[PDB]
Ligand binder design. Structure first.
Ligand SMILES: CC(C)(COP(=O)(O)OP(=O)(O)OC[C@H]1O[C@@H](n2cnc3c(N)ncnc32)[C@H](O)[C@@H]1OP(=O)(O)O)[C@@H](O)C(=O)NCCC(=O)NCCS
Ligand SMILES: CC(C)(COP(=O)(O)OP(=O)(O)OC[C@H]1O[C@@H](n2cnc3c(N)ncnc32)[C@H](O)[C@@H]1OP(=O)(O)O)[C@@H](O)C(=O)NCCC(=O)NCCS
Lengths: 287, 388, 388, 287
């Protein structure tokens, strides 16, 4: 498994908010070691039976959490993420959607220099089935297993999750890197982690239109990934230069079409599948 | 979010960038009156629509008599302009930009975007102005020069000069180019732009740099802190269903086909469309429910989707979400009854009570098939339009 | 470069930071008239001098009658205020700041400097307001909280809250503190400040944060791009010889002693002073010639140095530079003749023609010893004041 | 020797200016492999028999220079240094005085991330006697030798240079790190380089009031410097909170007095000398 496990101590920024509350309850029910939360102004209180702190630094001192899930509205995310980075949190899962691209541009530069890992934003989160759940994904469709999944899409990941549970392959870890143009972590970052993870036997890489993370990931896979990779790209039928929901799902300058990514993946030796319904089948094949 | 050329030019002005003398007029009378405010002809009259290729569609003309400005404004105001960058329906011309004629000596290109591969705002300059920049990138890559704004320092003058010297500019034109770069890069950062495109950035016969055109794209995600840009939104330039859907927390994007798609998740939405495609279908739209599929939301979804005549079936693919599968089914039922959906509706449901919600759909009586899985769902919606 | 409290407060205003209602008056009449513009007494009247400790020197008083404001202004305008932070000569009071009385509930400290050790602008906050911050740093280090501005991102709100929560602030005071931090950090970056000190940053009885005082230090090196600050310079607050020397490209700093030092290089200047000290001497000044020691420059140097009566000998230590040692000697000779230097002058010369310039000095007749090396030079200037 | 040698290819920014011209002539006469210069607007011309380029990048492509000496007025230095860093120059010697502290603050962060070394600003330069001369220092007082010198002051370095030549010790390399508050390189940076340099047998560290580079360098010396170090700090008689010439020579907050640095150096085992005239003597002692 990668990124998180049964031992990951997580705090939640925006903990006392609707989504922060609702999804922490789910995390807690799954056994994620949520150990606290941060909401400026409610430090010193308790919520979901955990301590609430005014700052991430008070929360880290107090709990030793090394991971933080962020449910802060977009306007305050840069601030939140930067506060976490500054407090020593080593892993940030940012669920928030709508963060200005220019903010993520800066954040990403920061994340890299501070050596902090961020999954997101505009992401569903991360889950190591049976061990840890951070995010908004539905835990009941997962099955502890051997397939690692990385995707720019939440729902499409679930489809792949369902399939890998229904073929009995299970999932080692699922990483939703999010649908924003400048994510904190990209396919190559996560792919490298799956390659080095004994528990992960095969990889499902789910992409879509826009950018070139998939094309670069292909190049990377050919050269450094040895485990088998099944891939799927959404947006074959997407018009160019129109945002398809996710901020990053947009073909800018006629570059980054689904076909290009498919082809680039095929060339790198990745087992691509045209229908998302056949991800499971394709795994069976190279498994 | 796109701005009009006249708006981009106001902005450029505000940042001390050079642009023609011009006024955005909303009536033929204002337009003809703007001529004298401008001075000696001839004058350039340009329809203001977000799309490009206005030139090749006759929406840009250099006239030399007020009587001409008037005729042009009369011909276009209230009419819709169709360019190769708009759908066949075109975009409404509500403003005619009347500017001074400019003496073009040479045409350059200067633009900027967020480069996702290098994770930086990147300015691009070329001597190949007046041309589609993609074409130049295709064919003469060595003529496109780039600089990446350093997030730690902000745009630096040497980057502007780098581009200037690569464009072979010299003398005062270098200082002028640098100024334009510094300000465009400043605007990019301060207004949270997503895109800047000056095509063409012109060297005038009198030997000065001038922004003959301007195309600004704002980052929608940043509009909450861009009040000025916020007010500049011209809703008439887009399919109204988009803004309509947005107030309802739906992401709608009209397509050509006849199979409406309603899905939660952008990824699942695109993937759903593709599967309908793979199975011989033709997706009519992208509509991502994404926000809790409440009953009313689904109703809205249907109204928006079906507001397109070409729609002869609607595929609903919902995997998970906040509402349980049976509540989702009731809303589909309720929306189909109420909205008076007259088309077959195929529904794929996954999650808690998937089967109970499937049953509810089957027992409704309404023409709503509950698919058993995604591949099935597709084949059924595809089949459901055969003939219709 | 230092600003006056009233100037810092204008600046704070400009950035939406809260400061008392007040007016900088230059005549007793304006000062007494400012009372009514302010409102109900009592009013705080403060001499405006760059130094601090104005309070302990009687330059700050809370009066309750216009007749009092007047008396105060009359007592101070045109007079010089001496505080523990000024030399015995004090600083001229040309403005009296008349502000509204403030209801102090608690006194905090908020300030910022460039921390050379961490190479960042660092804000510092303490509940120990009204106290010399150094004292608090000495004794209760755990009460001083700090944040470092990240050059890549600019000041961030969480840093302001961090400090706010460490100061135990709560409720609206946290938002208010954050605003003040964000703006002070913005001012720091935008005006190229070297230092910001709000002591005290007050929580008023009505429960609001207010800048009771303000001490801003600008980076002199950045004044070329700070036109506003440039105009705010109050030359009267410093020894005039300093600005005088500066136009001449000399760095002058008056000291106590009687041995004038003229050296090229700040390091050599300080080191020279120290050697004169080591050898029982008492340096009267620091004067770094640094800019090419032309004849006229040296003449200026002498005028500035000798403009201090306490000076009973002048040590000239010149190691290298742009002018050859003999030309330097001529200028010393010329300056000593012209300026009519009536004191012994010891000269240490190193570089091309060191000896030829030494000869020229010896053959001048003038009371100018050419030292043979630095230790010697010192002993000779020290000796040269013995008795004088 | 450190930083530069007979093989260092240097370009000069502000090359066609007064100081850029005058000091490049001196460099050239000394044998420094000056290979060109940059002055926006005069690219394509020649000056001092070297090519002049419009940008540093054109100059580096053309000459392969890995070092750049900057003689650009203060208002344009940030721009210059940043341009050099961006062009791949690995060593920047910035002579310029008056660079806003906030500019050096940013530059320093950049220099460190880009892995570029900068000596200065407000510095005299660097010279490896007999091999390379970059800067404004007078080459004739140097003597190829075994003593490495680092100083925050130009003139005081010359005094130490003179002494080490007059005791026949000679100099391995002289690094004037400059008198600004945020230098590009500091005592610890240079000290580490002298420790690892076989040719340098002893070190002369010259400091002054302000900051805490000397105190930190002491701590560093105790722990990682084995060669003998003679030290001298100027400003014993300097008032507090008054700039003594160099922008960085100022005792801020009563911290950073000459005595503190002396004592901190003494404690770390450094041979300190109270009179700058006895640097040579002190070397003889530990040599
Ligand atoms: C992040 C998001 C879910 C937050 O929504 P929300 O919970 O309804 O918002 P709320 O206002 O209820 O809660 C936000 C909380 O953040 C808090 N907050 C604000 N700034 C904060 C900061 N810097 N640090 C910590 N908490 C902060 C507020 O205190 C608020 O909680 P409160 O109600 O106790 O005051 C929403 O903005 C969003 O982005 N949704 C899209 C998620 C998504 O679609 N992801 C894609 C994965 S497929
Ligand atoms: C750096 C300094 C010496 C420059 O002074 P200068 O040579 O008289 O200034 P000039 O104007 O003659 O030359 C500067 C040149 O820089 C050039 N320049 C400006 N911006 C430039 C840039 N970004 N890149 C390259 N060159 C640039 C100009 O073109 C000019 O040359 P030109 O005359 O050919 O147009 C001076 O500003 C300074 O800082 N002096 C103090 C040095 C010092 O005391 N150091 C302490 C060590 S002890």
């Amino acid at each position: 498994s990668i990124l998180i496990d049964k031992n990951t101590k997580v705090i939640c920024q925006g903990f006392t908010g609707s989504q922060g509350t609702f999804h922490s309850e789910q995390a807690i029910a799954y056994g994620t070691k949520m150990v606290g939360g941060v909401t400026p102004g409610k430090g010193g209180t308790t919520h979901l039976g955990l301590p609430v702190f005014n700052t991430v630094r008070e929360a880290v001192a107090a709990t030793g959490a090394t991971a933080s899930v962020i449910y802060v509205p977009a306007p305050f995310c840069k601030d939140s993420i930067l506060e976490a980075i500054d407090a020593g949190i080593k892993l940030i899962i940012t669920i928030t959607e709508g963060i200005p691209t220019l903010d993520m541009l800066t954040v990403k530069v920061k994340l890299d220099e501070a050596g902090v890992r961020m999954i997101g934003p505009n992401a569903p989160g991360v889950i190591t089935p049976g061990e840890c759940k951070i995010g908004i994904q539905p835990g009941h469709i997962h099955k502890p297993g051997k397939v690692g999944i990385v995707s720019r899409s939440g729902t499409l990941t679930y489809e792949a999750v369902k399939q890998t549970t229904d073929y009995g392959f299970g999932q080692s870890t699922c990483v939703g890197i999010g649908g924003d143009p400048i994510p904190g972590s990209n396919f190559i970052d996560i792919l490298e982690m799956f390659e080095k993870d004994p528990q992960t036997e095969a990889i499902v890489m789910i992409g879509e239109i826009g950018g070139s993370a998939e094309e670069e990931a292909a190049a990377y896979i050919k050269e450094h990934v040895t485990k088998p990779v099944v891939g799927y790209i959404a947006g074959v039928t997407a018009p160019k230069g129109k945002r398809m929901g996710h901020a990053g799902a947009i073909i800018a300058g006629g570059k980054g079409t689904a076909d290009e990514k498919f082809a680039a993946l095929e060339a790198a030796g990745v087992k691509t599948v045209r229908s998302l319904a056949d991800i499971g089948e394709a795994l069976k094949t190279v498994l | 979010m796109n701005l009009h050329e006249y708006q981009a030019k106001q902005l450029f002005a505000r940042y001390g960038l050079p642009a023609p003398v011009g006024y955005a007029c909303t009536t033929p009378r204002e337009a003809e009156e703007a001529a004298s405010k401008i001075g000696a002809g001839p004058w350039v009259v340009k329809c203001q629509v977000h799309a490009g290729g206005r030139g090749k569609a006759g929406g840009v003309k250099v006239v030399n008599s007020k009587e001409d400005i008037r005729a042009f404004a009369e011909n276009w105001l209230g009419k819709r302009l169709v360019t190769y960058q708009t759908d066949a329906n075109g975009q409404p011309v509500n403003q005619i930009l009347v500017e001074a004629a400019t003496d073009i000596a040479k045409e350059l290109y200067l633009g900027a975007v967020v480069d996702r591969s290098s994770r930086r705002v990147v300015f691009m300059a070329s001597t190949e102005g007046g041309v589609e920049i993609e074409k130049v990138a295709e064919e003469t890559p060595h003529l496109i020069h780039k600089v990446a704004l350093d997030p730690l320092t902000g745009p630096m003058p040497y980057q502007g000069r780098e581009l200037a010297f690569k464009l072979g500019l010299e003398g005062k034109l270098v200082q002028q180019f640098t100024k334009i770069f510094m300000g465009l890069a400043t605007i990019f950062l301060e207004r949270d732009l997503a895109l800047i495109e000056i095509n063409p950035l012109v060297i005038t016969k009198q030997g000065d740099l001038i922004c003959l055109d301007g195309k600004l794209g704002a980052d929608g995600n940043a509009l909450f802190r861009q009040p000025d840009l916020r007010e500049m939104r011209d809703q008439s330039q887009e399919d109204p269903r988009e803004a309509q859907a947005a107030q309802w927390e739906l992401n709608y994007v009209a397509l050509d086909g006849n199979i409406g798609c309603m899905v939660n998740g952008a990824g699942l939405a695109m993937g759903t469309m593709d599967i309908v495609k793979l199975h011989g279908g033709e997706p009519a739209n992208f509509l991502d429910v994404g926000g809790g599929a409440t009953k009313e939301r689904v109703t809205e979804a249907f109204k928006i989707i079906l507001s397109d005549d070409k729609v002869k079936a609607v595929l609903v693919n919902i995997f998970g979400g906040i509402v349980r599968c049976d509540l989702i089914a009731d809303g589909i039922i309720g929306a189909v009854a109420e909205v008076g959906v007259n088309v077959p509706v195929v529904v794929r449901l996954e999650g808690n009570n998937a089967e109970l919600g499937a049953k509810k759909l089957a027992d409704s009586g309404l023409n709503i098939i509950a698919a058993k899985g995604l591949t099935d769902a597709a084949q059924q919606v595809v089949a459901a339009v055969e003939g219709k």
